[PDB]
RNA sequence: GGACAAAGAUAAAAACACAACGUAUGGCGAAACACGUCAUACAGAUCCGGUAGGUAGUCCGGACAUAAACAGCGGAGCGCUGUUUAUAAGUAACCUUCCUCCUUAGGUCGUCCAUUCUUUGUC
C-alpha cells in the first residue's frame, strides 16, 4: 500500500542542474521525515539530505552542501531534490526513503523507492561498436570452447545482449560494463559451447542499444587456419 | 564533527545454516539510534533492524541486533539462500546521517581453478584503429585472482581493465574478463601476447598466449 | 507605704499590596530541529549592620549568590575570568513632623512593640 516513486533522473552535463521528484502513495509526507540517499555505481549507500515534518527543517551532507536543495510540496504529496553545479562524482542512483514512525520503527527508513539514475558526463549518446571474439583456433581445454562479442565505446547505459536471437541462453556471462578513460562504456558477453559445434554451428550475438537506436547481429566464427 | 560508522568485515563467505555476525563501530556515542538494512544487487535496501535491537515488522526472526557500547552487531542465527546480500548499518543519532561501508555475504565453495581463454583483437577493430585483447577466466572460486599481461614476454601495467561477474546461482563461482587496450600500431609492433593467471586453485601460474598475425 | 533614679531578669513587636513575561529537562501530539500541550524545576523573599531600646521576606547601606550587557584570556562561534547594571511595582500610596519657592513639588521626622518581676540609692 505504501510506495515511493522517484523520477526526473537522467544525463546532465557537469555544472548543470537537475531536479529529482519523489512521489508518495499510501501515506502523507507531512507526517514523516523524507530522506534522499544516493549510491554511486559499484559503491555503497551515501546519505544525501533530509527534510523534517511540520517545520520544513533541511539537513544536508557535506558533499552536497550549498549545491542541493530538498523541498516538499504537500499538495502534490511530493518531495524534491534540486541539484545545481553537478559534477561527475554525483553520478548515482538516488533513492528517496520515508523515515518510519519513531514508536513503530524508531528512526529507521522503512520504505524506499526503486531509485533513479543520474549520470553526469559530457559524453554524447554513441551507438555501440560490436566486435567478434573468435573461439580458440587451437583445440579448447575441457572440450568446450568460448566465443564472445565486445560491445565497446557506447554511451549511455544500458545494452542488451542475446545469443542466437535468444535461443542460446545457457552458459552466457554478460560482464559488467567498465568506464574507460574515454568516458565511454565497454563490456563483453561470452558463451561456452561444445567444441564439436564450432565448425558446424554458426553463433550470432544480438546487441541492442535503445538510446542510440542500434540493433546489431554479429556472427562470431573461428578464424582461418 | 560528523559521526563515522566503520563496518567489518567488508566481505564474508559463509554457507546455508551458518550463524553470521557483522559489527559496526561509531566514532562517538550514537545511543541506540542505529538501523541495519539488506540491499540485493540492483534493488532498494530493506529495513532489517531499528533502534539497534528491534526487529522490523515482517522481518524474519533469525535476524537480531545487539549493542555493546558504540559497537553494534547484526546476527543471523541460520543463513538461508535468500539471505545472501549486502548489509548496511546506519546511525541516526545526530545529523548528518552516516552509513557503514557495507558487508557482502557470499556463498562459500570449493576452491575452483579458472578456465582461461585468450581472444586476439578482431580485424574489424584493427580497421577501426584500436586493438583490444581479452582474457577470460571462467568459473573460479574464490574471487581473489591476478592477471599479468605480457607483450613479447614484457609485463604491461596500466593498460588493462578488469570486470568480474556476481556469484552464479547454480555453480556459486565468479568469472573475470581482463581487457588490454593498445594502439593499433603498438599492437602491430609486438609478436607475442600472453595472459598469466595466478589463483589459489592454480598450483602454478597458468598462461594462455597467441602471436600477432598467426591464425 | 508611696515617688524619682540606676542596674538586672523576662516578654513583645509593622499597615496595604506583593505581579507578569519566560527558560530548562523529560513525556506525548503521525513529531531528532521548530511548534503545540502536560509534568517537574527555576524565575534573591540569603547573610550582616543600622534605622536615638527592640521587632525586617519587602527599609537604608554593604557583602555574597544568580541573570543580562561590556572588557580580557585560550584553542565569527564556543568556554572561562573581571567590571557595570538588575533581581519587582513599593518602605510607592494615605496620614503625619520639619525644611527648601523642584511648592499642581522635592527631601525629611513618625506610623509596630516596649510586659512582668528583682536589687540598690535618695526622699
Ligand atoms: N514598615 C517598617 C518600617 C520600619 C521598620 C523598622 C524596623 C527596625 C527594626 C526591625 N527589626 C524591624 C523593623 N521593621 C520596620 C518595618
Ligand atoms: Mg537587618
Ligand atoms: Mg511580614
Ligand atoms: Mg527595593
Residue numbers in the entry:
A (entry chain H): 4 to 228
B (entry chain L): 1 to 215
List sentences quoted exactly from the publication behind this structure.
The yjdF motif RNA is a riboswitch found primarily in Firmicutes, located typically in the 5’UTR of the orphan YjdF protein gene. This binding promiscuity makes the yjdF riboswitch stand out among riboswitches, as most typically recognize their ligands with high selectivity.
The crystals diffracted to 2.77 Å and 3.05 Å resolution for chelerythrine and proflavine, respectively. The ligand-binding pocket, which is the same in chelerythrine- and proflavine-bound structures (RMSD 1.129 Å), resides inside the central core of the yjdF aptamer domain. Moreover, proflavine (pKa = 9.48) is expected to be protonated under our crystallization conditions (pH 7.5), enabling a cation–π interaction with the pyrimidine ring of A56, analogous to chelerythrine. Possibly the observed electron density results from a mixture of different proflavine orientations around its longer axis, consistent with low selectivity of the binding pocket. The structures explain the ligand binding promiscuity that distinguishes the yjdF riboswitch aptamer from other riboswitches.
